[PDB]
Structures are given as structure tokens and as C-alpha cells.
Amino acid sequence: GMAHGYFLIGPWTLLGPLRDSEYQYIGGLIGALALILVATAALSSYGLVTFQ
Amino acid sequence: MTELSGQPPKFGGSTGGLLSKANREEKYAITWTSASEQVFEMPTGGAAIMNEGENLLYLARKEQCLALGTQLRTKFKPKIQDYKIYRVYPSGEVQYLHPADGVFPEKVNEGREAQGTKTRRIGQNPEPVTIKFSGKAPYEV
Amino acid sequence: MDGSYAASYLPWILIPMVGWLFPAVTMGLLFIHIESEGEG
Amino acid sequence: FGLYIHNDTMRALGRPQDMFSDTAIQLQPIFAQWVQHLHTLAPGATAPNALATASYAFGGETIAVAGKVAMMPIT
Amino acid sequence: MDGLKSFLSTAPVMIMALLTFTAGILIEFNRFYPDLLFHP
Amino acid sequence: MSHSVKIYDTCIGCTQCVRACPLDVLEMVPWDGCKAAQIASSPRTEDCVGCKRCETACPTDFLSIRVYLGAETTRSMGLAY
Amino acid sequence: MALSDTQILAALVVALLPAFLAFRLSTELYK
Amino acid sequence: LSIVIFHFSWKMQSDVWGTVSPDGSVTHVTLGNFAQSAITINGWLRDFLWAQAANVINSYGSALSAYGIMFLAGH
Amino acid sequence: ADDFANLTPCSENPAYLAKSKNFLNTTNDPNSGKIRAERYASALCGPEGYPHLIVDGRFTHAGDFLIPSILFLYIAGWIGWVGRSYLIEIRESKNPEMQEVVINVPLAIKKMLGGFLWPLAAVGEYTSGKLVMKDSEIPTSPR
Amino acid sequence: TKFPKFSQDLAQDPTTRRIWYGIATAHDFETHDGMTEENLYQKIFASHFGHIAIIFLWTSGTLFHVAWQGNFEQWIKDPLNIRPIAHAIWDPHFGEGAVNAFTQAGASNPVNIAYSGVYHWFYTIGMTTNQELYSGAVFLLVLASLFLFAGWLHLQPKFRPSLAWFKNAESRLNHHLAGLFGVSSLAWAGHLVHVAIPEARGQHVGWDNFLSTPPHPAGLMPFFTGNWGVYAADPDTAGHIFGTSEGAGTAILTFLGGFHPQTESLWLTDIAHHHLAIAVIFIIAGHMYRTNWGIGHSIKEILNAHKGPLTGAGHTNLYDTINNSLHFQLGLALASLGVITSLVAQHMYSLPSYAFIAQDHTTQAALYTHHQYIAGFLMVGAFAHGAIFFVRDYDPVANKDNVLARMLEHKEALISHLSWVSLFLGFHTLGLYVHNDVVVAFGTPEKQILIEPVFAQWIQATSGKALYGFDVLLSNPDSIASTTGAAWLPGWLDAINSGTNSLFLTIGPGDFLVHHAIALGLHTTALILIKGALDARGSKLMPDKKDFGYSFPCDGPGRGGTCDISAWDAFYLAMFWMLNTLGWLTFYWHWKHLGVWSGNVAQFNENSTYLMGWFRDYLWANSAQLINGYNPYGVNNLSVWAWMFLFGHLVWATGFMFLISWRGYWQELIETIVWAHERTPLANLVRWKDKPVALSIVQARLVGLAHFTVGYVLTYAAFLIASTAGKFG
Ligand code: CLA
Ligand code: CLA
Ligand code: CLA
Ligand code: CLA
Ligand code: CLA
Ligand code: CLA
Ligand code: CLA
Ligand SMILES: CCCCCCCCCCCCCCCCCC(=O)OC[C@H](CO[C@@H]1O[C@H](CO)[C@H](O)[C@H](O)[C@H]1O)OC(=O)CCCCCCCCCCCCCCCCC
Ligand SMILES: CCCCCCCCCCCCCCCC(=O)OC[C@H](COP(=O)(O)OC[C@@H](O)CO)OC(=O)CCCCCCCCCCCCCCC
Ligand SMILES: CC1=C(/C=C/C(C)=C\C=C\C(C)=C\C=C\C=C(C)\C=C/C=C(C)/C=C/C2=C(C)C(=O)CCC2(C)C)C(C)(C)CCC1
């Protein structure tokens, strides 16, 4: 998670819609946090189904 | 069933062989006796070398073993009609599959019980409306 | 994006709720359901 | 094709600055441009005994015959 | 010979020959009498 | 699971279905309904994939061996994974 | 005249009733 | 190959072919519209297909009418 | 007296006249357009000036669909009748298929020539039993 | 695994197919495990309740969004110059350009304009404020709640209806004719007379006053006596102005035909009178059948009594044949409903009932296309369920020798003559079209075979259209059909003889050619569907096909090859021809009405004869605005329709993939992908719970058809809407 969340900042930070605003880094951060939340849900669901 | 013997064919490896299913679910084995070291087509792609004497080979599916068996019995100078095919479970349990009673099924044999037999023509199956709200189809009755 | 109709703060949170939360939750429930291997 | 779909969606939404284009998020064919430039400089340099470029599609003057243009650089 | 005759009598040769004959007829009839949209 | 493979009484015992079957679903068993004194049998339909080679092979006026595809298993789907 | 915020919120509460009844009909039809 | 030949046709009509003036001004066939239109699918549907199909459909009553006929025939 | 009021004869339509004074030549004859402007003037046109045809059945427009219908039906009856008789004759020649792919040109031309009496032969085969076969003597599929 | 619980076979499937098929067979209750007939009917009853409730909730959403985010009260003032809006847009994806483009129709925020004609409907029936629409939507919330609860309750054992209750056809027919159809039409005539008609005359009638304000000054006295003519009274004058009392009458039941001069729609008093008469007839008809009082008919006796010397057993046992086959019943319902849905489509555009809806050309086009497509789906489903009947429910011994079995007995004749009519139509319609195309191409358009549709013009004359001068029936004043003094005749003639509406649009050779294209399409779709239904039990390739069910992949490559052998495949093939037929008919309608609204009828009249005119003058030209919804220069309110046009093209082309390329190639590719996953480290940590496999053969056909149809409908909808809206008729 450390590795993945660290590098997941960049894409939206430099290319997302907030890149040309005064909230470029905040927009990248928000996108990365939402992505990590969805990925956590996916990981947990996989674990819930595969180890019954 | 007991234990299986035979030497693995001379082969360097393919990507077409066994996958996780072989260890997790089921696998198949084919044994055959060859008169010499001869090249044959690997059902998973490539050419392999069978050895003189006994040969055991593990394949992913029963149809692959049967395709190899037809190739052995149809494409070799002295024909090889000696191959036996088994189903191998991950528990170590081995199950003899082919040929069932020691005789190829193409030719008749005593002591065989007919299965799937229908004592009528196709055109004598009942009408589905006569069997609806059961669970059966006109061939199952 | 705005709205002059009554209670125009409702799409503000309902559009994310209908587009993100509702599908995520229902797909997760249906996923855990169709994969459920309880006998029967 | 995904780049095309992204550009269609961005332009439809009135967001031209978010498109892939020479005036927004540029995707310059840098290597092909460099090879075109190398071709243009070949006559007299890396091609000493060549008077002109092998093909004016790589660059140079706009060769025109009659009212039409025969061949010119292709950016 | 007999083989050449049996070949010239085959179905594609005969169908193309008849199509050519009919096309000649139609083309020439429209050459001498064009634009017959209907009978006077 | 598996498919269903039925053999009807129009069987002439030519055995071509057994030779065509690439998974050893069929056998020949003794019978007295035809001159060949043999009838096809499907004692191993759990291995049957349903490729219909037997039906392709059958010579009788409309097939004497009939494959009805049914519940799909990894053996019946021809899966090697 | 224009609908009021109270009217919008009152309709959501009312819609909570068809929601519960649809849940009940769904789960019973599952039986 | 359909995409390849469409690319060739449009690029040559936009950024290559055209009329040169006695002054030297180059007025291309479709006025250099490739850079902003060929980046979206709607651009290819409108400025390439729909726009340049105007000759094939209006070809009736002229020498190019067989081309419109074969157009419909291919469809 | 006032039928087809939405149509006027092409000789009375100004659009038809303005277009017919520019009718294009059809063949090598430079008077084919004038021949068109003469011939089509008798039929009914319309606002656009293009001649309209009347398949209504009235004999004042018998040339619009009746005469061509008779001609086509005659030719097509001839074709089908001679082909069918060729097939019937060939059927009893021990190997009809080979004669269906390799034509029996003598018999074929003979059957084609005797096709001008095809309606008489059709009626004659109907009154006997050569035209229509009985249903229980025809193969069918299960119901 | 558990899912799906109604099929052990699918439940034990170890592949992803298990999922797909579990979704695809849910509603086929008959093939659930352990299903009985009684449980079947009970589950269907409760599903029906759920479906009605869903309909009510949908209508509630429409009412609610018009009342909350629309411009209903403003649109009522200036209904010809204001565009009705459906609901507000909330999309965080929008940029400034799109925000500007969609704050339209006077709105102060992004909005879509409605094309369902719902504003005209709600305004015509007497609603005038947002509060009324909101109260309606809350009431529909309650009605849906009631039907949902009823559906739940009838699954409870004590309230579970018996099979004999479901099989009581006589009582249900009586109730549905007299009560469901009759009393509903009566109550609607009461709403018209009490609310809608007074509202149209400037009077308010709502729950606050409707008790103390009669619909007529005389009130019920003439009804219970003779003197019914008092209600025909003084009708609204020609100068009546909708919503005000200027020129308003007092009558409640009239029969003056024609259209309201200002609103260009049927008179509300005519509509009320129609519903009263229909109510009377339906109530009378709902007494035909026997129930609990000896009087009444047995449908079984009627069917058994109708035998002829030339139809064998006649209709014997058809009562049980239909009463025991839900697929026969559903096919009948679907066919009849599709016919009357096409009827609705043909009459609403021609004889509209909602005030000012005729001048709203995009709504008219959209509603016509909508109802025609619904009709096509309904017809295809009708024939598909007829095939399912033949497969699952048809009984040869009880239906022996009757008309049903006799249809199978000569099925080869039916199929062959359908083939012949399709070939006839196709050959010759295509030949005339191509002749016209070539003859116009070479610069000699005078040599076109232009057949005047004399028969339909003559029919128009029989109804009064004097344009053609046929002088037959209602086009001849001396006719006994026109010398009757019918109160509707002056208005009907005045409407049908003005070239200002869509009442019997003038027709010419283009209409002839497209009508034969329509005949070809109907015949070929019917041929496919009927060949599938009549061969579903068996042919010579598959003499035992009834043992293989309605839907199955094939019969293998043997016996010549048997791709698309099942009757389901016949449905799937016929779907393409239905979509093609509807394309032709909607092209015809849209182009003709484009000319009508633009005043330039000459374009369609002179260029619908050759197909290049259809190509350029209809498809190519009317795309100009649609295709410029977004361009390098900016964005307008047509941007959504342009993007949807492209979206439909994409979905259609995507379905081509499933249709053209069949399954084994994909299974091998998926096997390579499975190997790639099982051997890639880190990814090896994760494994699929279901074995990935290629989509099945039937699944492929269905998914490809679904993409084909979605793309079809969306492409044409975006085109129709955007062209008619950018041009404004
Ligand atoms: C499939 C339907 C169809 C039909 C209805 C027509 C019909 C027609 N076309 Mg057209 N056309 C079609 C398809 C069709 N076309 C297609 C697909 C194309 C694209 C290739 C064209 C392109 C086209 C062109 C370019 C032209 C036409 C023309 C014509 C007209 C010329 C007729 C004529 O005089 O020829 C010949 C007339 C005959 C009578 C020939 C038959 C003679 C037979 C062989 C002799 C038999 C007589 C018999 C012995 C008598 C016995 C009588 C019995 C009672 C005993 C005609 C009305 C021409 C025109 O100018 O239109 C006005 C023309 O130039 N068409
Ligand atoms: C379209 C894809 C995309 C995009 C747009 C970006 C965009 C970006 N990336 Mg990312 N990246 C990507 C994909 C992408 N990345 C992928 C696929 C990977 C591989 C998984 C990476 C992995 C990667 C790493 C490892 C880093 C970035 C970083 C960055 C940012 C560097 C630019 C900058 O701000 O300058 C400034 C850059 C720096 C100041 C570098 C940080 C220096 C620190 C102090 C490290 C010092 C090294 C040393 C070992 C200290 C450790 C101390 C320890 C002993 C206690 C930038 C916004 C950097 C970043 O996030 O900025 C903090 C960075 O560290 N990227
Ligand atoms: C089936 C009818 C229907 C439809 C198609 C829509 C459509 C829409 N609504 Mg609306 N809504 C409806 C009924 C409906 N509404 C009713 C009756 C109410 C009053 C309770 C509301 C109150 C409501 C609010 C407050 C808002 C919307 C909004 C929206 C838009 C965004 C989606 C959303 O957030 O919804 C959310 C919906 C709800 C919170 C209430 C549930 C709606 C009904 C009662 C349930 C429908 C169930 C349906 C029949 C199940 C069948 C599904 C089928 C596929 C099987 C969208 C265009 C948003 C908007 O205006 O966008 C700008 C917004 O914020 N709706
Ligand atoms: C009396 C006036 C007249 C004149 C000025 C012409 C002039 C011409 N004709 Mg024409 N023709 C005429 C009458 C006339 N014809 C009549 C009455 C018919 C009806 C039978 C035809 C049918 C006809 C056909 C079918 C052809 C010509 C062709 C030609 C050109 C080549 C002449 C030639 O002999 O080369 C060579 C001649 C031929 C290849 C065919 C000779 C025509 C005979 C009468 C019919 C034989 C066809 C056969 C029975 C069936 C076709 C099978 C095929 C393998 C040949 C030439 C400029 C040919 C052409 O157009 O060149 C491309 C050609 O193909 N004409
Ligand atoms: C007067 C008593 C009565 C009434 C009111 C009803 C009413 C109804 N029954 Mg019921 N039934 C009754 C007695 C009654 N039944 C009895 C005694 C029995 C036992 C013998 C049954 C047994 C029975 C069964 C088993 C079922 C029904 C079902 C239904 C529903 C049919 C589906 C539907 O909603 O379409 C509504 C139809 C109409 C409103 C009229 C048809 C409209 C026609 C086709 C054309 C449209 C006219 C007009 C142009 C529309 C305007 C359009 C508008 C948008 C402007 C319906 C609401 C079905 C159901 O859904 O269960 C919940 C069902 O399964 N009934
Ligand atoms: C109107 C009443 C009606 C009733 C209640 C039924 C009932 C039934 N039908 Mg029938 N049918 C109908 C109408 C009806 N049908 C129509 C109108 C058609 C023509 C299309 C058909 C044609 C038909 C066939 C060919 C078959 C059935 C079958 C069945 C049975 C199985 C249903 C099932 O589980 O499938 C579930 C359905 C699906 C999984 C697919 C749903 C497709 C959705 C609605 C469309 C998706 C649209 C897309 C997502 C839009 C994207 C939008 C976005 C891009 C913007 C079932 C008992 C099947 C059967 O079992 O035979 C006995 C069968 O083979 N029907
Ligand atoms: C434009 C596309 C197209 C065309 C032309 C056809 C054509 C036809 N379809 Mg078809 N179909 C199509 C698409 C098409 N289909 C698609 C996408 C599907 C879904 C997969 C179907 C599925 C389908 C089914 C299931 C059935 C048909 C049927 C038919 C026939 C109906 C009879 C008719 O039209 O009259 C006459 C025929 C025509 C007008 C077409 C022939 C046109 C040629 C040009 C005539 C001239 C011959 C030509 C000169 C030959 C010389 C070749 C040489 C030059 C090389 C007809 C031949 C029905 C049928 O078989 O009818 C009995 C039928 O059952 N179609
Ligand atoms: C492919 C299948 C092949 C074969 C199978 C086919 C089967 C049949 C299928 C379809 C058939 C369709 C119907 C075809 C017939 C259409 C008839 C038609 O078009 O007619 C068209 C004609 C047109 O001529 C009419 O002439 C009349 C003169 O009065 C009319 O009034 C009109 O002026 C004029 O339109 O109409 C008539 O039928 C004339 C009827 C005159 C006599 C009416 C007798 C009944 C009335 C008697 C008096 C009543 C009241 C007296 C008045 C006052 C005192 C109370
Ligand atoms: C628009 C064109 C329509 C194209 C349809 C297909 C054209 C092919 C012609 C079909 C001939 C069928 C041969 C029948 C074979 C036959 O002759 O059987 C003989 C049959 C005699 O049987 P009986 O009538 O004595 O049988 C008693 C009945 O109780 C049972 O049928 O006579 C008829 O059925 C005549 C009706 C045939 C016409 C079919 C009806 C078609 C349209 C029906 C319109 C309904 C209107 C109802 C309004 C109240
Ligand atoms: C004592 C009694 C009688 C007196 C009755 C009196 C004194 C009044 C009766 C009034 C009645 C019976 C009113 C009935 C109203 C029914 C309605 C309103 C039904 C359905 C509405 C629906 C289904 C939904 C409509 C929709 C809504 C909500 C919209 O807003 C949009 C349109 C649409 C979608 C259609 C008399 C003496 C007579 C007989 C003897 C007994």
C-alpha cells in the first residue's frame, strides 16, 4: 500500500482536471484516496469470496 | 490401479502442458511401451521423443490422452496398441479409465452392460406436453 | 452546475450516491451473493 | 482509439483544454520529426553528393508544378 | 471432339451464352427503339 | 452434470460412432436387434464433451445415437485449466 | 407557483414506503 | 487498410495538396483542417466522410454519376 | 370528367415542356430527346413534369401495365414450362443429374422451340395429372 | 454454489457461464427446479403486481420532475413558443460551454427539453399548476405502494389464489371488459366532463369545489329523462381560445368531428362522448360469459360448435389449448397489443388529442417512432411465444384435425408462399428503385417508372379527400353516405380537405414505392417468424427438434451443418428484419413530415423515387446540424445528440463482432489469457472464483443482437431528435 498509494498521486496531479487550478496537488490527493478506497473494497470482497 | 511406472518422454518443455488444475482438481496419465526411441507429436504443441520400453506421460485432459493414443496406434511402424489411460486425483488416488475392460470399445466384448439404450425409435419419444411440469425431457423417459 | 429549483443541494450528493455508492454497494452484494458457496 | 474517445467526450463537454491536441495536451511525434529533420539536412552533409533531399515530404521547399503543388513538407 | 462438345454444353457455358444472347437482344432493341416507358 | 447420449433401437452396430468418439464415451455391447449383433452404449457420458462426432458418423436414417447437451462441467466444457 | 423544499423532502419520506414494500415483494418472490 | 487510406486521403487534402498563388500563398484542398478535426471520431464523420461525400452524392446528371451508382452498389 | 385532378397531361404541364426542351440524347440519334418529348406528352405527368403511370386497370392506360404484364407473363411461362419439361424428360434418362449439369443441347433446344404453346400444354397437363401431384405422394417433414 | 437457486445444473457450473445463464433464465419460471403449475401462476401474479407498481413509480417520476425542475406553468402561457423541459441536469463533467448550451428554454440551470408530449397531455386533461403534478406523483407513490403490498399479500398462503381461479376465463373476461376497460373509460369520460372540459373553458374544477359545480347547468335532469340533446347544447365556437371562456361553449357531449381550430386537436367534448359510448359498449360486452347465474356463454361450447366441412375438427378443444398455454395467451396478447400500438402511432400523429401537440414536431416524430418500435418488438415477441407454444405446450391428440393442427399440416405451403411473396416484393421494388436511380443518374429523370398510388388516393377520396377528384362516397355530395346529416361530417370534411394537418397526407409515387418496401419488410419478418414457429417442432434436418427445446446452440456440423437451427434462432434472425422494416417506415414518416412542416413537399415528392435522394436529401443533409453539436469551434445544445449518434454507431459496430466471429476462436484466446495469468507472478496471488470461458453460441447471438439493437435505436433517435429540433420542423 505504501508503494502504490505513493505513486498513485502523480497521474491526476499532472494530468487530471485540477492540474490547471490552484488545487492541483489537493485534486491529485483526492483522486488517489478515492482510488485506494475502491481498491481496498475490491481486495476485501475478493478475500470474502475466496476463503469461505 | 496401484502405482504407475514408465519413463517420462525426452522433452525440453512447453507452455501447453499442465496448469494449476493438475494439482488442484484432476490430471490424466497415459502409459505405453515403445520398441525404440522415436519422435511423436506432443498434443500440447511440439515434438517429443518416446523411449524404448515403458513411458508414462501426464496430460491435462482425457481427450488429450486419447488423441495421443490414437496417434500412437495409427502413426507408428510397429503400431502401439498398449497404452493405458488413467485419471489421477490430487489425493494420490489413481483411476483406470481406458481401455475399460482391457479391450478397445470399437469391438464388442462380453460382460458389457448396455447403457443409454432406448427400446424405440427417435420418432417414438413422447410429446413434451405429456411430460411438462416434471423435470424430464422426452429422451429421459 | 447549479440549480434554482427547490432544495437544489439534493443532486449535489444524490448524483454521487446514485453513480458511485449505489452501484458499488449493489455490485458488491450481488458479487458476494453469486459467489456464495453455502450448500444449496 | 481510447484517445479519440477521450477527445470526443472532452470536446462535447466544452472542455477543449482537456483534449489531446497540438493546442492542449500535445502528443508530438518527436522521433519522426527528428528523422524528418535529419533527412532535410542530408544533402551536402551526410549525403554530400546528393543535391536535394530524397523526398520533399521530409521537408524543404514546396515544389509546385502548374497551379497545383507537386510536393511539399508533411508536418 | 466429343469432350470439347461436352464442355461447351456445360451449365456455365450455356447460361453465359444465353445471357449474352438476351443482352444483345435487349441492348439492340433499346438502341433502335429507346425510352419505351410504356406502350402508346 | 454431463450431457446425455442415448442409443435407439435403429442401431445397426456399425461401431463408427465408437471410433469417432474422441473421449471414449461409447462402447459396443452384444445385442440381437440387428445383423451385426451389437449395439452402441454410452457408459461414460460424464466425460462426454458433446462435439457430436458420433452423430456425424451414424449412418441410419436419422441418428440411432443422439447427444442432448445438458449441464456443463469442466470435463464437458473441454477445459484444461 | 414553485415547489417548496418541504414538498421535495416530504415526497422522499413518502417514497420510503414503496421502497420497503418493493423490498418485501422482492424477497418474497425470491422464495 | 480503410483507416490507412482514409488517413492518407485526409492528410494529403489538408496539409499537402492545394493551389499556389503567384505570390506563393498555399490554399490547401480542405484548408488545413486535419490538426483540429482528425483528433475526434465526430471530426472524421463530419469533416472527412460527410463533408467529402458531397461530390459522390451530387454526381448524378454528370460524368461522375457512375461513381455515385457504384457508391450505392457497394453499400 | 374530373378524375386524377392532381395530374395533368404532359402536353399541358409547363415544367415538363421546359425540361423536355433540354432532354438528353439516349443513343447516337440526336433526335431521341425530341422523340421522348413527343411520346411522353400523351401520358399524365404532374407538378415536377415527370410522367406518371396508371396501373389502375382502365384501358385508357392499357399500355402502362396491361400490355407489358401480358408480354412478361407469356415469356416467363414459356421459360418455366420448357425448363420443367426438360427436367421431366431428363428424369427418366438413368442419370438425370449429369444431364442437369451437362446440358442435353438437342433435347434442350427441342423443348425450348415447343414453348409457344405453353398455356395450352399447361391446361392440358392440369386436366390430366402431369401438372399437380397428390399430397400423400409428396415428401413432408414431421408436424 | 447457491446462485442460481432455481437450477441445480447452472448452480454446479464451474465457469462464468453459470453467471450469464443464471441471469438469462431467471424469468423462465416454467423451467425452474421443482416448479409446479400453481406455483407458476402465483409467481406470475405477484410479478405482475410488481410490474404495475414499477409503471406507477415511473409515471410518478415523470410528474415529479416536470413539477420540480420544469417550466410547466410558463409553458401553459405560451405553449407554441416555449419548449417544455423534462428535468434538470447535474453532471460534474460539464464544462462552461456545455453549461451555457444547456441552460435553455428560459431555465436558469442546465436542462433537457422533453419530447414525450407529456406537457401537452397534462395540460389538456386539466392540470395547470406544479402543485397538481406533485399531488399526482404522490398519489402514484401511494398507488404503487398498494399494488406492491397486494403482490406481497397474494404470495401468502391464505391469500394464494388457486389454479382454478386463474383458469376462470369467463369471469376474468367479464370483469376486464365491463370493469377494467368499461368502468375505467366511463370514469375517464367523467373526468373529461367534470375537469378537463371546464378547465379548457376558463373554469376551475378541483377537489375543493367539484362537488358543488356541475358539469352542465341542467345537471342530470336530462339524463334520467329523455332530452339527452341538452348535453350536445351549444359547443365551443370556432373562435374558442383554449384555457379561457372566450368563444367557449357549454356542451359536454358532442359529435362534430374535425379539430379544434386553435389547438389543432380533437375536441374535448368529442373525446368525452367517445369514452362514454365506448364505456357503454364495453359494459354490455362484459356480460357475455357465464359465471355464477346460469345465464351467459361458455367459450368452450362456442369454440366446439364452430366446425365446417372444410376445416376438419374446427375449433374443438381450443379452449383448453389456450387456457392451458401461457405462451399461447402471451403470444395472443403480444400480437394484439402490437397491432393496436401501431394503431396508436398512426392515429396520434394524424388525429391528435392534446392541445398544440401538432405544432410540436419533434415530440410528434419521437412519439410515432417510439410507438412503432414498441409495436415491432411486441409483434416479434408474439411470434416467438407462438413458437415456444409449439415447442413446449402444443398437444397433437387434443388439437387433432382442428384449425391449429391443420396449420401445421400444410406448413410447407404457407412457408413457400410466404417465400414467394417476399421474393416478388423484393425483386420488383428493388428493381423499380434501381431503375429510377440509374435513370436519374444519367441525367434523364423523366424515364422513371412512377406508379400513382391510385388505391390509397381513392380510399382517401371515399373519406372525403377531394384533392384527387375521384368523387366517391364522402367526396361526392350526392352520395347516400354523405346525405345522412351526420353531425361529424362538416367538421371531418373541413379537417380532411385542408392541407394544413396530417389527416390523410397526400401521397404519390414515393409513397407507393415505400409502401411496397414496407410490405416486403412485413412479409419477410412474418416469413422468418412463421417458418420458425411451424418448424420449431421438427423438420427434416431435425425431426426431433421438440426434444431439444425452444433454444439450443445447434445440432453439430454433421448432416450438412446445422447453424441457427432452433426456433430461437428464427426469432433472432427476424429481429434484424423487424429493425430494417422499422427503419424504412420511420425514414418514410420523418422525411415526409420534414417536407410537410417545412412546406417543401416537393423534395420528398420528387426525390423519394430513387434511393440516392433518400441517401443525400434525407440522411446526409439533415445531419448537418446534428453533426455540429460539437466541433473545433464550440458547442451547442445538440452536443448530447451528436455524442449519442456516435455512441450508437459504436454499439452497433461492436455487436457486429459477436455476430460475425463465432466462439471457438475466443475460447482459444481466453485459454492463452488464462495461461498468461497463471504464470505472471504477483498476479498469481489472485485467482478467479469462476473459470473464464468464451460466451456460448446462443449467448453470442443474443449479445450481438442486443448491441445491434441498442445502437440502431440510439443512432436513429439522436438523428431524428437533433434534425427536427435544429430545423424546428
Ligand atoms: C426489375 C424491374 C424493372 C422493370 C420494371 C424495368 C422496366 C423498364 N426499364 Mg429498367 N432497369 C432496371 C429494372 C427494371 N426496369 C434495373 C435493375 C436497371 C439497372 C441496370 C435498369 C435500368 C434501365 C435503363 C438504363 C433503362 C431502363 C429502361 C426501361 C424501360 C424499357 C422497356 C423496353 O422497351 O425494353 C424492351 C422492350 C421489349 C418488349 C423487349 C421484349 C422483347 C421480347 C424479347 C420479344 C417477345 C415478344 C413476343 C414474341 C410477342 C408474343 C406476344 C404473345 C401475346 C403471343 C422499361 C419500362 C430504358 C428506358 O429508357 O426506360 C424508359 C432504359 O434506358 N432501365
Ligand atoms: C501518467 C503517469 C504518471 C504521472 C503523471 C506521474 C507523476 C509524478 N510522479 Mg510518478 N510514477 C508513475 C506514474 C506517473 N507519475 C509510475 C508508473 C511509477 C512507478 C510505479 C511512478 C513512480 C514515481 C516515484 C517513485 C515518484 C514519482 C513522482 C512523481 C512526481 C514527480 C514530479 C515532481 O513533482 O517533481 C519532484 C520529485 C521529487 C521531489 C522526488 C522525491 C525525492 C524524495 C525525497 C526521494 C529521495 C530519495 C532518497 C532514497 C530519500 C529516502 C529517504 C529515506 C532513506 C528515509 C509527479 C507529479 C515522485 C513524487 O511523488 O514526488 C514526491 C516520486 O517520488 N513517480
Ligand atoms: C422511476 C422514476 C424516476 C426516475 C427515472 C428519476 C430520475 C432521476 N432523478 Mg428522481 N425522483 C423520483 C423518481 C424518478 N426520478 C421520485 C418519485 C422522487 C420523489 C421521491 C424523486 C426525487 C429525486 C431527487 C431529490 C433527485 C432526483 C434526481 C434524479 C436524477 C438523478 C438520479 C437520482 O439521483 O435519483 C434519486 C432518486 C431518489 C432519491 C428517489 C427514488 C425515486 C423513485 C421513488 C424510485 C424509483 C424506483 C424504480 C421505479 C425502480 C425500477 C428500476 C428498474 C431499472 C428496474 C434522474 C434523472 C436528482 C436530480 O434531480 O438530478 C438533477 C435529485 O437530486 N430524484
Ligand atoms: C441492320 C442494322 C445493324 C447494324 C448497323 C449493326 C451493327 C453492329 N452490330 Mg448489330 N444487330 C442487328 C443489326 C445491326 N447491327 C440486329 C437486327 C440484331 C439482332 C439479332 C443485332 C444484334 C447484335 C449483337 C448481339 C451484336 C451486334 C454487334 C454489332 C457491331 C459489330 C458487328 C459485327 O458483326 O461484329 C460481331 C458480331 C457479334 C459478336 C454478334 C452478331 C449479331 C448476331 C446477329 C447475333 C449472334 C449472337 C448469338 C446468336 C448469341 C450470342 C452468343 C455470343 C457468344 C455471340 C456493329 C457495329 C456486336 C457488338 O455490339 O459488338 C460489341 C454484337 O455483339 N448486333
Ligand atoms: C372490475 C374488476 C377487475 C379489475 C379492475 C381488474 C384489473 C386488472 N387485473 Mg384482474 N381479475 C378480476 C377482476 C378485475 N381485474 C377477476 C374477478 C379475476 C378472476 C377471474 C381477475 C384475475 C386477474 C389475473 C390473474 C390477473 C389480472 C390482472 C389485472 C391487471 C391487468 C394488467 C393491467 O394493469 O393492465 C391495465 C389495463 C387497462 C387500464 C385497460 C387496457 C387499455 C387498452 C389495452 C388500451 C388503452 C386505452 C387508452 C388509449 C390508454 C390511454 C393511454 C394513456 C397513457 C393516455 C388489471 C389492473 C393481471 C395482473 O397484472 O395482476 C396484478 C393478472 O395477472 N386479473
Ligand atoms: C411482454 C410480455 C413478455 C413476457 C412476460 C415474456 C416472458 C418470457 N420470455 Mg419473452 N418476448 C417478449 C415478451 C415477453 N416475454 C418480447 C417483446 C420478445 C421480443 C424481443 C420476446 C422474445 C422472447 C424469446 C426469444 C425468448 C423469450 C423468453 C421468455 C422467458 C424467459 C425470460 C427471461 O428470463 O429472460 C431474461 C432476459 C434477459 C437476460 C435480457 C434482458 C434484455 C434487456 C431488457 C435489454 C438490455 C438493454 C440495454 C442494456 C440498454 C443499454 C442502454 C445504454 C446503452 C444507454 C419468459 C417466461 C425466452 C425463453 O425462455 O423461452 C421460453 C426466450 O428464448 N422471449
Ligand atoms: C441489403 C441486405 C440484404 C438483402 C439484399 C437480403 C435479401 C433477401 N433476404 Mg435477407 N437478411 C439480411 C440482409 C439482406 N437480405 C440480414 C442482415 C439478415 C439477418 C442475418 C437477413 C436474414 C434473412 C432471413 C432469415 C431471410 C431473409 C430473406 C431474404 C430474401 C427475401 C426475398 C426478397 O427480398 O425478394 C427478392 C430478393 C432480392 C431482391 C435480393 C436479390 C437481389 C439481386 C441483386 C437480384 C439480381 C440477381 C443478381 C443479378 C445475381 C447476379 C450476380 C452476379 C452479377 C455476380 C432476399 C433474397 C428471407 C428469404 O429467404 O426469403 C425467402 C428469409 O427467410 N434474410
Ligand atoms: C385476393 C382475394 C381475392 C378475392 C376475394 C375477395 C373478397 C372480397 C374482399 C374485399 C372486398 C372489398 C369490398 C369491395 C366492394 C366495395 C364497394 C364500393 O367500393 O362501392 C363503390 C360505389 C361507388 O359509387 C357510389 O354510388 C352511390 C350513389 O348513391 C354513392 O352514394 C356514391 O355517390 C358513390 O361513391 O358505392 C356503392 O357501393 C354504391 C352503393 C349504392 C347502393 C347502396 C345499397 C345499400 C344502401 C341502400 C339504401 C340505404 C339508405 C337509403 C337512403 C335513405 C333512406 C333511409
Ligand atoms: C391483405 C391480404 C391478406 C393476405 C392473407 C393471405 C392470403 C392467402 C389467402 C388465404 C386463403 C386461406 C385458405 C383457407 C382454406 C379454406 O378455404 O378453408 C375452407 C373454409 C371453410 O371452413 P368452415 O368455414 O366451414 O369452418 C368452420 C369454422 O368454424 C372453422 O374454420 O373457408 C374459409 O375458411 C374461408 C376463409 C379463408 C380466408 C382466411 C382469412 C384471411 C383473413 C381473415 C380476415 C378476418 C376478418 C374478421 C372480421 C370479422
Ligand atoms: C356516493 C356515490 C357516488 C358519488 C361519488 C362521488 C360523489 C364522487 C366520486 C368521485 C370519484 C369516483 C373519483 C375518482 C377518481 C379516480 C381517479 C383520479 C383514478 C385514477 C388516477 C390515476 C390512475 C392516475 C392518473 C394520473 C395522474 C395521477 C396524474 O397526475 C397524471 C395523469 C395520470 C398518469 C393518468 C355516485 C352518486 C356517483 C354513485 C353512487 C355512490
Ligand SMILES: CC1=C(/C=C/C(C)=C/C=C/C(C)=C/C=C/C=C(C)/C=C/C=C(C)/C=C/C2=C(C)CCCC2(C)C)C(C)(C)CCC1
Ligand atoms: C405462432 C402462433 C400463434 C400466432 C401468433 C401471431 C403473432 C399471430 C398473428 C397475427 C396478426 C398480427 C394478425 C393481424 C390481423 C388483422 C386483422 C384481422 C384486421 C381486420 C380488419 C378489418 C375487418 C377492418 C375493416 C375495416 C376497414 C378496412 C376500414 C373501414 C372500417 C372496417 C372495420 C370496415 C399463436 C400463439 C396464436 C398460436 C401458436 C402459434
